[PDB]
């Protein structure tokens, strides 16, 4: 498995509306999409504002082809321009699990 | 939940020998004590010699009790003897999950 | 004892209009809600523009309580409102005391 | 009052030994020469292995007079070359107290 | 060869728009200027939201002819203000090619 | 000798328009202020847009009363009103001159 | 094309010795392996001491299996162990050409 | 002229011996070999245990034939020898003065 951690800073202060504007309008279309949901966090320590998520994918090439069809969704487009805006700054990583990780 | 995510950065080239030695030795202690493994992974792009771990806490007490357990193990002691100078920095943080995140 | 340092990173020239602000407007009601103030300072060095903050917890589970309450709050939710524009940036780490740091 | 907050990054595991040889050997003598210790901390969350000391000051000029003279202190040096091993990096930053900041 | 690696961090979502509008309006002035692009780059993993470029250059006093040839264009002008918004902040560095590096 | 080096990370494209503005309405009174003006720059290299200024002080205490009559002068505070909105962020350090350095 | 762009920060003053070990032992090895390097660099900008290296894919598929390769290469392992002491971090970026970018 | 400010993060507590060992055996070589030196400073705030130098040049290729004079010397290589332990890390930039710069 291939796992990306993908953190956004948010606007201080925003975390909340974020979460309750994804929840409505945006998770099950990114879900459905992307495939597994791992993890989906925001912060306590460190840079407050931050939300943290995890994604597994079976490959990089099917990481790219998930994203492209997230990315043309017409209903996914209207959630990004809703949401957008809390949005700062938007920063991503790959990793690999070792053999004992969980799943 | 509450959730911790930790990260070594390890002496390069060190990564394949670090989780050989902790699944070998330490995985089963650690895990014992502290109860929720949610992930445990090495970095492949950025800070290359990470490892990267996630643990879930009902709380911050438990997290101190069980920190505290794990700290006191005389195998423990042992094994971070053998590992230790492998690891460069450690930094942690806490994080919160939303309430959509699985699990 | 649990102790947090909050800083802030507010807009260039903002320190003194956010801390008169602060002290007329939000001192009294998170410092109740809150408990312990163990030290309130702006920045001479490194990042200019910072407000720093020392707050001291019986515990990680009274921080939460009393964090709620203050969060709940709507005088303080008032407040947040008059004064968060200034605020760029937001972290926080949590320090413990060594046996010999005063009170 | 000027406040001097010192930041030191310690070989990971060596917090606890560092502080017993600090409290046993150097407390006592620095305190003594610096004159208002107003927080002696370790770090539980970001980077881990940090010792965070605030100290105050009635002047700058204090401060030059006051480090003078712990830096010449024979025992000070013993002590320095007993526990300075374990010391990676060092950081310091000078800050202000508001009106309202405590003591 | 003088190699320069250029760094760009765009507002969150516009890479795309950047890019299709630079090599519509600017790319061919700023090749003609410059003499030679070695590379021209959106970031996949690390901060996302990056446009990277690499120039080589025949010497630093070239690169400043050059770079000065291009800010007085006035097509160059007319476009760093049409694209200058998307740019939230820049850096570059200077490289010397290893001498088996190719080309 | 107290020396100063204050960085101000500038908007992008920024830094002309302001060195012009500060010549033209600042300098003459932050230096008549200040005293020892050791050198003013803008980057070539590095974070982009930064402006770097050097300032020597006779004792912390002197640069304290310059800075305080600087912050109090009110053609200064008309200055800072026109060019201030050109800085995104500020920061300062405190640097001893090795013996052997000139001046 | 998938692009690569990895740095190690090197001993201070131990570039050349690299370079020169590297060429000599491990380039028509590394090359052979991975198959399209773009660019070989050293820093003289910014952190000192940095190898900067640029190499192209065509799929991450294939940069695994050829990274694979190169890693159980015995000969390749035999350099790693006589260059390695020379590099204290290693970090890593996937990067994506723009349509116009050359090559 | 070109100005280049290059810092050094030596080991702590070495700043002191730096200095002595520099000053007896290196600047004569270091100033004749690179011409004009603006400032060499240790610092107080942020980072500990830097050393900071700034050097001025008539050019981009005056500084390179420099370097390599002084690079080639062969008691200058004898300092670098004895004092090149004392490094950890190095980093440099460059900057442009502002028209009304002194000197």
Same mark, same amino acid.
Request: glycine fraction near 10%; proline fraction near 5%.
């Given at each position: 498995?291939?796992?990306?951690?993908?953190?956004?800073?948010?606007? #201080?202060?925003?975390?909340? =509306?974020?979460?309750?504007?994804?929840?409505?309008?945006?998770?099950?279309?990114?879900?459905?999409?992307?495939?597994?949901?791992l993890?989906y966090?925001?912060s306590? =320590?460190?840079?407050?504002?931050?939300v943290?998520?995890?994604?597994?994918?079976?490959?990089?090439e099917?990481?790219?082809?998930r994203?492209?069809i997230?990315?043309?969704?017409?209903?996914?487009?209207s959630?990004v321009?809703?949401?957008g805006?809390?949005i700062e700054?938007?920063?991503?990583?790959?990793? =690999? #699990?070792?053999?004992?990780? #969980?799943?």
């Open positions: 498995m291939l796992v990306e951690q993908r953190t956004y800073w948010l606007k #201080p202060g925003s975390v909340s =509306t974020f979460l309750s504007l994804y929840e409505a309008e945006g998770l099950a279309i990114q879900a459905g999409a992307l495939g597994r949901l993890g966090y925001f306590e =320590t460190g840079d407050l504002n931050r943290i998520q995890l994604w597994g994918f079976d490959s990089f099917d990481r790219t082809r994203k492209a997230l990315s043309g969704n017409p209903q996914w487009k959630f321009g809703r949401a805006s809390m700054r938007q920063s991503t990583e790959l990793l =690999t #699990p070792a053999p004992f990780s #969980p799943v």
